Write an enzyme that holds these catalytic residues in place. Sequence first.
Site, PDB file in Angstrom:
ATOM      1  CG  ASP A   1      40.972  26.440  31.101  1.00  0.00           C
ATOM      2  OD1 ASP A   1      41.287  25.243  30.966  1.00  0.00           O
ATOM      3  OD2 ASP A   1      40.077  26.992  30.428  1.00  0.00           O
ATOM      4  CB  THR A   2      45.702  22.722  32.348  1.00  0.00           C
ATOM      5  OG1 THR A   2      44.605  21.800  32.342  1.00  0.00           O
ATOM      6  CG2 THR A   2      46.147  22.967  33.789  1.00  0.00           C
ATOM      7  N   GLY A   3      43.618  23.816  29.896  1.00  0.00           N
ATOM      8  CA  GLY A   3      43.178  23.595  28.527  1.00  0.00           C
ATOM      9  C   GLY A   3      43.157  24.871  27.694  1.00  0.00           C
TER      10      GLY A   3
HETATM   11  C1  LIG Z   1      28.266  29.523  26.600  1.00  0.00           C
HETATM   12  C2  LIG Z   1      29.069  29.453  27.918  1.00  0.00           C
HETATM   13  O1  LIG Z   1      28.269  28.865  28.947  1.00  0.00           O
HETATM   14  P1  LIG Z   1      29.071  28.795  30.299  1.00  0.00           P
HETATM   15  O2  LIG Z   1      28.199  27.827  31.160  1.00  0.00           O
HETATM   16  C3  LIG Z   1      30.621  28.013  29.969  1.00  0.00           C
HETATM   17  O3  LIG Z   1      31.721  28.911  30.194  1.00  0.00           O
HETATM   18  C4  LIG Z   1      33.006  28.429  29.962  1.00  0.00           C
HETATM   19  C5  LIG Z   1      33.691  28.722  28.744  1.00  0.00           C
HETATM   20  C6  LIG Z   1      34.990  28.233  28.512  1.00  0.00           C
HETATM   21  C7  LIG Z   1      35.661  27.445  29.452  1.00  0.00           C
HETATM   22  C8  LIG Z   1      37.053  26.921  29.188  1.00  0.00           C
HETATM   23  C9  LIG Z   1      37.017  25.646  28.249  1.00  0.00           C
HETATM   24  N1  LIG Z   1      36.172  24.688  28.927  1.00  0.00           N
HETATM   25  C10 LIG Z   1      35.110  24.155  28.190  1.00  0.00           C
HETATM   26  O4  LIG Z   1      34.834  24.433  27.026  1.00  0.00           O
HETATM   27  O5  LIG Z   1      34.445  23.305  28.985  1.00  0.00           O
HETATM   28  C11 LIG Z   1      33.285  22.634  28.490  1.00  0.00           C
HETATM   29  C12 LIG Z   1      33.369  21.145  28.872  1.00  0.00           C
HETATM   30  O6  LIG Z   1      33.208  21.097  30.282  1.00  0.00           O
HETATM   31  C13 LIG Z   1      32.092  21.962  30.472  1.00  0.00           C
HETATM   32  O7  LIG Z   1      32.165  22.612  31.756  1.00  0.00           O
HETATM   33  C14 LIG Z   1      32.737  23.884  31.472  1.00  0.00           C
HETATM   34  C15 LIG Z   1      32.064  24.345  30.169  1.00  0.00           C
HETATM   35  C16 LIG Z   1      32.032  23.030  29.331  1.00  0.00           C
HETATM   36  C17 LIG Z   1      38.435  25.075  28.002  1.00  0.00           C
HETATM   37  O8  LIG Z   1      39.074  24.747  29.228  1.00  0.00           O
HETATM   38  C18 LIG Z   1      39.314  26.070  27.219  1.00  0.00           C
HETATM   39  N2  LIG Z   1      38.912  26.146  25.810  1.00  0.00           N
HETATM   40  C19 LIG Z   1      40.094  25.690  25.050  1.00  0.00           C
HETATM   41  C20 LIG Z   1      40.137  24.192  24.644  1.00  0.00           C
HETATM   42  C21 LIG Z   1      38.791  23.477  24.805  1.00  0.00           C
HETATM   43  C22 LIG Z   1      40.732  23.920  23.252  1.00  0.00           C
HETATM   44  S1  LIG Z   1      38.644  27.761  25.482  1.00  0.00           S
HETATM   45  O9  LIG Z   1      37.966  28.454  26.681  1.00  0.00           O
HETATM   46  O10 LIG Z   1      37.617  27.879  24.345  1.00  0.00           O
HETATM   47  C23 LIG Z   1      40.076  28.661  25.030  1.00  0.00           C
HETATM   48  C24 LIG Z   1      40.848  29.363  25.912  1.00  0.00           C
HETATM   49  C25 LIG Z   1      42.002  30.082  25.549  1.00  0.00           C
HETATM   50  C26 LIG Z   1      42.386  30.099  24.295  1.00  0.00           C
HETATM   51  O11 LIG Z   1      43.683  30.905  23.889  1.00  0.00           O
HETATM   52  C27 LIG Z   1      44.169  30.544  22.770  1.00  0.00           C
HETATM   53  C28 LIG Z   1      41.694  29.450  23.381  1.00  0.00           C
HETATM   54  C29 LIG Z   1      40.552  28.740  23.752  1.00  0.00           C
HETATM   55  C30 LIG Z   1      34.990  27.155  30.657  1.00  0.00           C
HETATM   56  C31 LIG Z   1      33.688  27.628  30.922  1.00  0.00           C
HETATM   57  O12 LIG Z   1      29.088  30.013  31.149  1.00  0.00           O
HETATM   58  C32 LIG Z   1      27.764  30.431  31.504  1.00  0.00           C
HETATM   59  C33 LIG Z   1      27.853  31.630  32.473  1.00  0.00           C
END
Ligand SMILES: CCOP(=O)(COc1ccc(C[C@H](NC(=O)O[C@H]2CO[C@H]3OCC[C@H]32)[C@H](O)CN(CC(C)C)S(=O)(=O)c2ccc(OC)cc2)cc1)OCC
EC number: 3.4.23.16
Lengths: 99, 99
Positions: free
Chosen positions: A25-27
């Site tokens: 995850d680059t994000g």
């Molecule tokens: C309620 C959860 O339901 P889920 O379906 C989704 O599970 C995830 C959660 C997070 C990510 C990574 C973030 N991608 C994401 O949110 O994706 C969104 C949009 O695309 C969709 O598809 C994937 C889930 C939607 C993103 O790449 C990283 N975020 C940071 C950024 C947006 C600022 S982060 O994960 O909140 C984060 C990581 C590390 C940190 O260290 C400081 C801080 C924060 C992917 C999948 O799982 C069900 C089993």
Amino acid sequence: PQITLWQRPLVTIKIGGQLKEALLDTGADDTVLEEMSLPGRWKPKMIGGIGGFIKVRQYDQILIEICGHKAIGTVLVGPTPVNIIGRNLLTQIGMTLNF
Amino acid sequence: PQITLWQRPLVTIKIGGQLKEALLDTGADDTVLEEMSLPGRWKPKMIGGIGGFIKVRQYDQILIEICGHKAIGTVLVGPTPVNIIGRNLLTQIGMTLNF
Ligand SMILES: CCOP(=O)(COc1ccc(C[C@H](NC(=O)O[C@H]2CO[C@H]3OCC[C@H]32)[C@H](O)CN(CC(C)C)S(=O)(=O)c2ccc(OC)cc2)cc1)OCC
């Protein structure tokens, strides 16, 4: 090698003796993994993203084996919906975005 | 071009004739942008993140430029902490992970 993004870039890491499926995850600034036991002391922390924040335990200097490399980095452990490999570790293995 | 990951992969995107900063996010299936106006009708979509699920507005076949590359695809608008360019658009500009 090259990893396309047609599908989620998943990889299998080896950490603390366990194998886990994780997302390159680059994000993500940091690597965040589901609840697990890790050695050493930790610091409480709050990380936010889509949906809000979650409380996690921060562990530093953790050895993780990914894509044939043995990288060292910080691991945040908590109730994350998916295992995530952040930039903190991606850099160590020389991973870059190309287009 | 190549983008290392020591810093956040923030790039300039152009949407609706305006320049905005967005994060190249391999961990996101979709592209989610901060509150803004887009043409036409929108459909509802529920997406999950690290902190839970949020409701977003789905607009299709939207023109968006990323790093100077033109793309036309689905853009979600909702309460995201930052503009994120997901795989749906990263694939349109030929972006891949390499090491
Ligand atoms: C309620 C959860 O339901 P889920 O379906 C989704 O599970 C995830 C959660 C997070 C990510 C990574 C973030 N991608 C994401 O949110 O994706 C969104 C949009 O695309 C969709 O598809 C994937 C889930 C939607 C993103 O790449 C990283 N975020 C940071 C950024 C947006 C600022 S982060 O994960 O909140 C984060 C990581 C590390 C940190 O260290 C400081 C801080 C924060 C992917 C999948 O799982 C069900 C089993």
